């Protein structure tokens, strides 16, 4: 015992305190990334085989420095010894011992790994992904250990929620530089493994919170100079934490250190391609897939997503001013103009128009229509604005005064009220009581609603999981059909509706549909397939009854977007709205037995049926950018024939340019919308349906891979788990067979009925209890780490 | 316990050459991954110094696909014939995982020095 | 009885707005605060003191002849 | 048409992000302040700085669009004012 402790300390001469009684191991409960030929998954197990020794400091203080010793056979001892004395000089490598000790009466080899931390990054990842309000423990310990916060902070009410505690983002940000250091150190590990010829799979199980790597028990060696570290599961599982913890902030400072001031970029610099490649080289040097700084050069939709993810990460570095429309001066009839000619998307990069006309002669009706719609000229003519009422970037003010809008109290029908009271209603102790009213608002309503678009943050999504989710979701829209239509096939519900800021001043949408011919409409539609047209959406204060004093607003979008999204999603969506018996239920009436038919469809062959419902905290103002791009993409998938790739990409560019991050004029002033979605385009409800389906399926996958995988009984489900892991983190291409099988699995065991942001699911109880399908817990975890919102019990 | 590649990947002979139609008849040890959506080869092994083109007819036989290769990767292996110094090649676009599994299979199932 | 309270609060704020009290931003803000408080309240005693508080705003003006309007 | 020409002449190809056009060329600024405290930090005194430029005060109004003098905005006199205050300034040269 005493000699064992004296040997573990060895030449180090530390003050090892045996946090484990005698020469016995210490079984801990830690998360692992496992892939054998039997079981696969990222799940938390029980670890034997190690005895731990915390180091003591001078004044009997205990520091997070542990001497983990591993007991195993002789074969592994030799295997790790012969490959530890190959890469011993890499700073990313923890120092090993490789001794032998006379445990009991026989000789056993032990490998002493020295100076690790209590938790590896696997614990951090599993804690921040699979969160529980009442099972934090390890998250609290990590968060307090590294002087990010204090313990009395955890006594705060709803400390863990982003919405009503906007300080929790600051707390997580104090852990951020450690992850940057870990990546910056694992890059040299990869380089040394290359230089010395080692082949294997790096996992975030064997990397400490310092960044040191300490396990080689599954590795093989080859000729030096050609090593292939398989960084595929590692980066994929580590993605979300980088943007949740804001781990790249150091790049905003000069010389990459938080102490020094920020880098003062040139205001007129708009193309940051070189910096994007520089950061990608610095931090993800060994990521096999190619990277396109500008999403124009992508090969198809999947490469668009894969490049957009890294762009979303890197866009937190560059100044906020260099994002938006790109203006150029063009003379028409000798008159210099200021017209939009290109755009700088945070997620897509730089896109230049192809049909820009310089030194034109006359402006036809379509040219005047376009040059009067984009905010370029209105912005270049206005005066600079600075508003302290909100945090989101502001552009300018069109007028010389700021108009203030309010709401009216709503009128009272005393006749019906008296007739009701005379009928024994509205008395004391009644189960019926007035809970719906026409509330009023002050002169600050919309500006108090835009700080709800404040709640949206730059978000990365786990990219490989997201790609597979796109593939599986693509099947739920397989029975539908659509494609481009000419100007003669559009059908408009009501023509007496407003057009927008720079059009409402003169007429209504009837005037514009009936002034320009069909040929002009087709010309504009074809123009939008090789350019970008920024627009302005007006923000409007709704006037209706509600159960809570919230000033809900609506968005009146401009008319160019109306035509150029109608001519496309009209045929896409009229198929959806007229189809019965599908998961999407939009366009079906509840009357004439429709509601009963819906419910009978929901209960379609559910074995152990139970019902579950949820509601997202703020569906419209928190939806991360990537999921909206995904919705637009899976809606645009139905154009494999009618258009080429560049046309699809430009349509998506216009969609994200006038619905995602556009300029809203609220009270006579232009503000930039950080993200979210605008209710008032042609495709809000269906996009929200797509988002709901995506969240449900990703919750299902995250649930099924969180399971142990050894206690699982049915061989079919175990094979499903193994192949699902293989298809997520080990396949570069799509597998139609397995996605077919998996879609069949969910449709059999987990049935959904979806309308806009609201959902009803019938699910198998046994599978949920065994963790085979998603439950309320997994779904809440998914919302937490992919929407920056914590759902409570009052919404589910 | 993330194991590199359970189950081994076997080989089959194939044709390669330096350029255009230089694939003569049969010169390469193609290590191939059989998927029922079509046989998809991973690696090429040769005693020929510089082969950048490789050839394989499709299943129908009316077409014949060409594949491109990396710069040669040197190694030497011990066999009954003594030391044999060979070059392995990978098709461009090959992810790191396929390289990892093929090198694991080679370094486990083939003697090397 | 609180139903009558909420109904008369609604009508009172309606007449206050039609009296262009909204042209004083702070006054209208306070009146809106009081209205939103009354409709959301659950106890009757608090509603009475809030409604008399916001009615004092009406009675401080000189645009509504009370004595003629109180015809009984 | 004088200042904007200077900036656009300085671009590599002529393209400049739109958001800096009113940041460098606009000749007027208006600031909306929610309370006296934030007013102290930004628009204290008869002139202030922002966007690497010096701006001079000329006019202040409240939510009711009526004149209010710079002496009137004190800590004690503050609760007697509407507080989306509007202040306009001119680019000093
Ligand atoms: Zn790409
Ligand atoms: Zn098309």
């Amino acid at each position: 015992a005493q000699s064992f402790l004296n040997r573990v300390c060895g030449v180090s001469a530390a003050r090892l305190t045996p946090c484990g009684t005698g020469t016995s191991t210490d079984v801990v409960y830690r998360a692992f990334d496992i892939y054998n030929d039997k079981v696969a998954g990222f799940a938390k197990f029980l670890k034997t085989n190690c005895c731990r020794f915390q180091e003591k400091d001078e004044d009997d203080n205990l520091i997070d420095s542990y001497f983990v010793v591993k007991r195993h056979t002789f074969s592994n001892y030799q295997h790790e010894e012969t490959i530890y004395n190959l890469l011993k000089d890499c700073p990313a490598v923890a120092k090993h011992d490789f001794f032998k000790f006379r445990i009991d009466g026989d000789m056993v080899p032990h490998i002493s790994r020295q100076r690790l931390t209590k938790y590896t990054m696997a614990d951090l990842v599993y804690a921040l992904r699979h969160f529980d309000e009442g099972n934090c423990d390890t998250l609290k310990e990590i968060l307090v250990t590294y002087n990010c916060c204090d313990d009395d902070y955890f006594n705060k009410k709803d400390w863990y929620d982003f919405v009503e505690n906007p300080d929790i983002l600051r707390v997580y940000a104090n852990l951020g530089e450690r992850v940057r250091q870990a990546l910056l150190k694992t890059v040299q590990f990869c380089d040394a493994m290359r230089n010395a010829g080692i082949v294997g799979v790096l996992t975030l199980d064997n990397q400490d919170l310092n960044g040191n790597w300490y396990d080689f028990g599954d590795f093989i060696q080859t000729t030096p100079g050609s090593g292939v570290p398989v960084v595929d599961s590692y980066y994929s599982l580590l993605m979300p934490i980088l943007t949740l913890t804001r781990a790249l902030t150091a790049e905003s400072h000069v010389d990459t250190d938080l102490t020094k001031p920020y880098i003062k970029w040139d205001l007129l610099k708009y193309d940051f391609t070189e910096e994007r490649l520089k950061l990608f080289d610095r931090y993800f040097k060994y990521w096999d897939q190619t990277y396109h700084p500008n999403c124009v050069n992508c090969l198809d939709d999947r490469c668009i997503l894969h490049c957009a993810n890294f762009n979303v990460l890197f866009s937190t570095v560059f100044p906020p001013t260099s994002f938006g429309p790109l203006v150029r001066k063009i003379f028409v009839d000798g008159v210099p103009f200021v017209v939009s000619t290109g755009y700088h998307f945070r997620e897509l990069g730089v896109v230049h128009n192809q049909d820009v006309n310089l030194h034109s002669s006359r402006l036809s009706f379509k040219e005047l229509l376009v040059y009067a719609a984009d905010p370029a000229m209105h912005a270049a003519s206005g005066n600079l604005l600075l508003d302290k009422r909100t945090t989101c970037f502001s552009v300018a003010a069109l007028t010389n005064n700021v108009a203030f809008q309010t709401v009216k109290p709503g009128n009272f029908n005393k006749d019906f009220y008296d007739f009701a009271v005379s009928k024994g209603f509205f008395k004391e102790g009644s189960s019926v009581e007035l809970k719906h009213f026409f509330f009023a608002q002050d002169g600050n309503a919309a500006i108090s609603d835009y700080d709800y678009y404040r709640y949206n943050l730059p978000t990365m999504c786990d990219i490989r999981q997201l790609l597979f989710v796109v593939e599986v979701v693509d099947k739920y829209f397989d029975c539908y059909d659509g494609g481009c239509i000419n100007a003669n096939q559009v059908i408009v519900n009501n023509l007496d509706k407003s057009a927008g800021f720079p059009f409402n001043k003169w007429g209504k949408a009837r005037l514009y549909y009936d002034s320009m011919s069909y040929e002009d409409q087709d010309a504009l539609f074809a123009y939008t397939k090789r350019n970008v047209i920024p627009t302005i959406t007006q923000m409007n204060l709704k006037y209706a009854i509600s159960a809570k004093n919230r000033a809900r607003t609506v968005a009146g979008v401009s008319i160019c977007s109306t035509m150029t999204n109608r001519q496309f999603h009209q045929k896409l969506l009229k198929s959806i709205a007229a189809t019965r018996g599908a998961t999407v239920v939009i366009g079906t009436s509840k009357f004439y037995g429709g509601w009963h038919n819906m419910l009978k469809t929901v209960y379609s062959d559910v074995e152990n049926p139970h019902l579950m419902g949820w509601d997202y905290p703020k569906c419209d103002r928190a939806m991360p950018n990537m999921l909206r791009i995904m919705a637009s993409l899976v809606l645009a998938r139905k154009h494999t024939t009618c258009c080429s790739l560049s046309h699809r990409f430009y349509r998506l560019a216009n969609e994200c340019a006038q619905v995602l991050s556009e300029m809203v004029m609220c009270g006579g002033s232009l503000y930039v919308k950080p993200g979210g979605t605008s209710s008032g385009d042609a495709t809000t409800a269906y996009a929200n349906s797509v988002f709901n389906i995506c969240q449900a399926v990703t919750a299902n996958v995250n649930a099924l891979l969180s399971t142990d995988g050894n206690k699982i009984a049915d061989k079919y489900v175990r094979n499903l788990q193994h192949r699902l892991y293989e298809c997520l983190y080990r396949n570069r291409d799509v597998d139609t067979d397995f996605v077919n099988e998996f879609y069949a699995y969910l449709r059999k065991h987990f049935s959904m009925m979806i309308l806009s942001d609201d959902a009803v699911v019938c699910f198998n109880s046994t599978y949920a209890s065994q963790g085979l399908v998603a439950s309320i817990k997994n779904f809440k975890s998914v919302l937490y780490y992919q929407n920056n919102v914590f759902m409570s019990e009052a919404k589910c | 316990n993330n194991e590199l590649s359970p189950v081994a990947l076997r080989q089959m002979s194939c044709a390669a050459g330096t350029t255009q139609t230089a694939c003569t008849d049969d010169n390469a040890l193609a290590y191939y991954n059989t998927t029922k959506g079509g046989r998809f080869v991973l690696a090429l092994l040769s005693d020929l110094q510089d082969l950048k083109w490789a050839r394989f007819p499709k299943s129908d036989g009316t077409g014949t696909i060409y594949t491109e290769l990396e710069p040669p990767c040197r190694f030497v292996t011990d066999t009954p014939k003594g030391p044999k110094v060979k070059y392995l090649y990978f098709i461009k676009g090959l992810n790191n995982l396929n390289r990892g599994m093929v090198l694991g299979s080679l370094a486990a199932t083939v003697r090397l020095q | 009885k609180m139903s009558d309270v909420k109904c008369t609060s609604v009508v009172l704020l309606s007449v206050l707005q039609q009296l262009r009290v909204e042209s004083s931003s702070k006054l209208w803000a306070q009146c809106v605060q009081l209205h939103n408080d009354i409709l959301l309240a659950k106890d009757t005693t608090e509603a009475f003191e809030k409604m008399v508080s916001l009615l004092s705003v009406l009675l401080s003006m000189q645009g509504a002849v009370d004595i003629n309007k109180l015809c009984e | 048409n004088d200042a904007l020409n200077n900036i656009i002449n300085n671009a590599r190809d002529g393209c400049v992000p739109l958001n800096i056009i009113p940041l460098t060329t606009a000749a007027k600024l208006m600031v909306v302040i929610p309370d006296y405290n934030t007013y102290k930090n930004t628009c204290d005194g008869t002139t202030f700085t922002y966007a690497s430029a010096l701006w001079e005060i000329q006019q202040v109004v409240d939510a009711d669009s009526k004149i209010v003098q710079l002496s009137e905005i004190s800590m004690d006199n503050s609760p007697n004012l509407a507080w989306p205050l509007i202040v306009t300034a001119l680019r000093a040269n």
Side-chain angles (χ1 to χ4, degrees), chain A residues 543-572:
Chain A
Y543 188 53
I545 197 165
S546 48
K548 40 178 60 55
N549 56 326
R550 187 195 154 179
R552 154 151 171 161
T553 63
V554 286
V557 70
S558 298
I559 205 79
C560 302
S561 54
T562 300
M563 271 146 278
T564 61
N565 289 15
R566 190 175 290 274
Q567 289 203 56
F568 185 78
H569 305 301
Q570 195 82 358
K571 186 177 181 180
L572 181 60

Side-chain angles (χ1 to χ4, degrees), chain A residues 406 408-412 417 426 428 433 437 439-441 549, chain C residues 1-4 6-7 10-11 14 17 22 28 32 36 39:
Chain A
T406 65
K408 281 190 283 184
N411 290 318
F412 172 47
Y417 177 84
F426 292 164
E428 288 47 49
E433 172 56 60
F437 307 92
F439 297 90
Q441 309 298 343
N549 56 326
Chain C
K1 184 197 288 204
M2 72 305 287
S3 55
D4 291 331
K6 303 173 151 202
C7 298
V10 163
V11 185
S14 189
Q17 179 177 359
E22 183 178 1
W28 179 248
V32 175
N36 281 271
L39 292 186

Side-chain angles (χ1 to χ4, degrees), chain D residues 62-92:
Chain D
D62 50 20
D64 295 323
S65 293
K66 51 184 54 169
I67 192 66
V68 286
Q69 316 297 327
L70 286 84
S71 48
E72 271 172 334
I73 181 163
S74 77
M75 182 305 297
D76 58 355
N77 185 45
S78 89
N80 288 308
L81 313 160
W83 275 107
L85 288 184
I86 297 89
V87 183
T88 177
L90 294 151
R91 193 186 303 253

